[PDB]
Subunit: 152 residues, 6 copies
């Protein structure tokens, strides 16, 4: 689609505690995507329950929210062509037992409840998650010096 | 299912000769598995033949045994949930021709007779290999400081 | 001194454009320091002139401010024992021509006007830079799961 | 099947511009393949048109040749068993959207027109591409010290 | 001066706990030194007190032995020309505050009591430490395939 | 001073044999220097003797020449401000015993007769070595997409 597509990527509290902030950012950075927003944050419980509002009936919802509250979160917005779908491919399968080596979860995660990172699963959910986690002023506008070498 | 499942991972003499001990250990270390036993050994021929007992009448058996005798072996025991199956996924296909990049054999190996590493193919074979290569006191009991961040 | 000492580290616009956000964060992360605040920001010219207010009489001041405005900045606050002095050691000499390999500038920078990163040179300047760049609510409070293994 | 098979790998101008010469070479070097020829060249227009002669009727042909002329190319010849097929697997799918993480394009590329690298798709085309890009005297004959550890 | 010199390198419990076994081994492996013995052990109290016998009058002696007992240790014997002196340089200064980036402690450690690794400080002390931590049968004799390329 | 200063960097046969082409290129590539010429060559004895002409009556001259003939050499020309002096700093001390970790020889070499790489010691010697190893048309003229972010 368009090279200005954006997605929401968040390093979960287990990824921060295990020192994976650098490696995870390098995966998207080396792929050619543009970081337009990033901040370390500890959101309230109500925001995390809204982020996972589609899973409010799951049995693991209560444990998921409390685990997302157990530490800081590195919330990011990455911009690039097909960055939503490609971003999920970089993260790996939701259950890292089903993820392939070379992906984030395939290299670092074991339990589905401790899968290190989060990524938007659709363009519409990406826009809803970006507006939920970031203010419009936190989206930084700039052009990469190698844009014409990453994109045709 | 059980987070205390154990598998036997061994760096074959070609992996030792090519300076791959560090990177191979980092594959399991960065994934979140616990190293409970490790030693550099040059095991006798009988132990290696007992290790590959199910392949005694294979055409490549004699060559496999002498090649496993041609250099030191880094024998390891890794502990973690589904470490047996996931460990095999980390190693890649037995023939690195069929292995995917991002795995150990997919990044370092070419020939099936020089596939760099070994991994237990099942839980029962893992217990038999662990008892064959390691004495019980050589398995170290300890608790990882990030156990609760790797497992839910 | 105290293990709660904080310093201000910022990835300059040249470091962001060249894709060094991941590697730089990994230097402090692998050393054992705790990231307590981080955000991607494009500060106004007045804030950057206050950040370098001690150099308002330098001939390179006008070019320094405009260069700091040419792209986004990854502003960070790292916490750890002697993190101010050790942080400068990790960055390297101000002129990367005088920096040693293994440091950030020793591995990535050439020109002093394009030295990729910034670091506070004293505890007092660190407190002034932290309050200048970050709001008090952006400092996230948490304890690393390996704190007792990094510190005695 | 034979260990003396050769393929032509070429780092495209976008790969050179984005500082990927080192990492791409390490992918084949760490796998066990032998570098027998390499040079940084800026070939004439007629050479690139012959390289993609089978795509002369494609609508993107003129733009492909023009973009391949816009910068230097790191032309290489790698030798090893099944190096053509395995080399293609290391590069990843032609469209980086379909490429897997762990491959070259899966880690570094996004656009099909900016897939940073090229590899021969067959042994016949490899010989034709090697004869087109290299003089026979530029292929260096040597024996790797770890040959007997890579191959059985 | 002789290439058969041996030193004792030991990854301390904090190094094991922080997932640094792989990276530390790669430091010596990539330099050209040969691993002739390695094991993951949890030594008794009397062995650690003999290891630091020269520091029995230090005030931090009791705490040092207790902390060295609090987790597993990766005991290693590396062989190479001037491996004792060069090994100390690779580890870095005893106090990580004085260590340089690029060394093990300069990249991973902060506290003197948590410097993640140990190395023999002399050839005489290396022989004493090797005889204390390893049985003679645990030192594997082999010839590196790149020996004639590491040494003249 | 001049950003178009050029130096001659060559990977010696031991560096090629030990699979160090990728990492060595990344040292100069990540620092921000521009690769303008590169080729894998097996130069004749006379060229190598002319390269080390100032050492003709040294005791190690004959051994140095035959060792430089024993394998392929990756000859390169790198361009950048103070690339000659900084390039030598990246390589480390001639005797890797005296070299610091973080440099090429400090991370990969042990013996002075096997110090992996070569670098021009002065600007005038660089011009003489570049003309000795490379034809003028083999030097590629191009502009890095991040030139204005590496240099002020
Ligand atoms: N069975 C489970 N047990 C515990 N946690 C789970 C389970 N399934 C999903 N989760 C957690 O809930 C989050 C939401 O998962 P979901 O949105 O369905 O997939 P994804 O987050 O990969 O798009 C996941 O990131 C995962 O950490
Ligand atoms: N056709 C073959 N030729 C040579 N060696 C082989 C062949 N098949 C298997 N081997 C070697 O024998 C070992 C045992 O193979 P097997 O146990 O069947 O696969 P895995 O090691 O993946 O469990 C392999 O690691 C491989 O190195
Ligand atoms: N001579 C110079 N020319 C251009 N820019 C300079 C020069 N000296 C310093 N700078 C820039 O001004 C910034 C402030 O430098 P200074 O505060 O003196 O050292 P540091 O920032 O390393 O503590 C530096 O980060 C550098 O990028
Ligand atoms: N639809 C397209 N649009 C733009 N460029 C393309 C397209 N398809 C292929 N190319 C370019 O043409 C080159 C030749 O493609 P092809 O030979 O079919 O794939 P491969 O290079 O993987 O063998 C590719 O490397 C790619 O950069
Ligand atoms: N002042 C101190 N406080 C706490 N621990 C110390 C102190 N000095 C040394 N140690 C510990 O004792 C060990 C032995 O120190 P020493 O042998 O003098 O240095 P090295 O281990 O570099 O040879 C060190 O590894 C260090 O962990
Ligand atoms: N004493 C020695 N013994 C063996 N080889 C040596 C010795 N001194 C130098 N050499 C080799 O000769 C080459 C030329 O040395 P020299 O030019 O003086 O240092 P540099 O290569 O750092 O400029 C070195 O790269 C080294 O490999």
């Amino acid at each position: 689609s368009m090279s200005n597509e954006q997605t929401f990527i968040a390093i979960k509290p287990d990824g921060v505690q295990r020192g994976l902030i650098g490696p995870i950012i390098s995966r998207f950075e080396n792929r050619g995507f543009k970081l337009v927003a990033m901040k370390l944050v500890s959101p309230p419980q109500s925001q995390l329950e809204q982020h996972y509002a589609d899973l409010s009936d799951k049995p693991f919802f209560k444990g998921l929210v409390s685990y997302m509250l157990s530490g800081p979160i590195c919330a990011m917005v990455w911009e690039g062509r097909d960055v939503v779908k490609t971003g999920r491919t970089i993260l790996g399968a939701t259950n890292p037992l089903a993820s392939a080596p070379g992906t984030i979860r395939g290299d670092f995660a074991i339990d589905v409840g401790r899968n290190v990172c989060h990524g938007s699963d659709s363009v519409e959910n990406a826009k809803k998650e970006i507006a939920l986690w970031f203010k419009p002023e936190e989206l930084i506008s700039w052009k990469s010096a190698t844009f014409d070498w990453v994109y045709e």
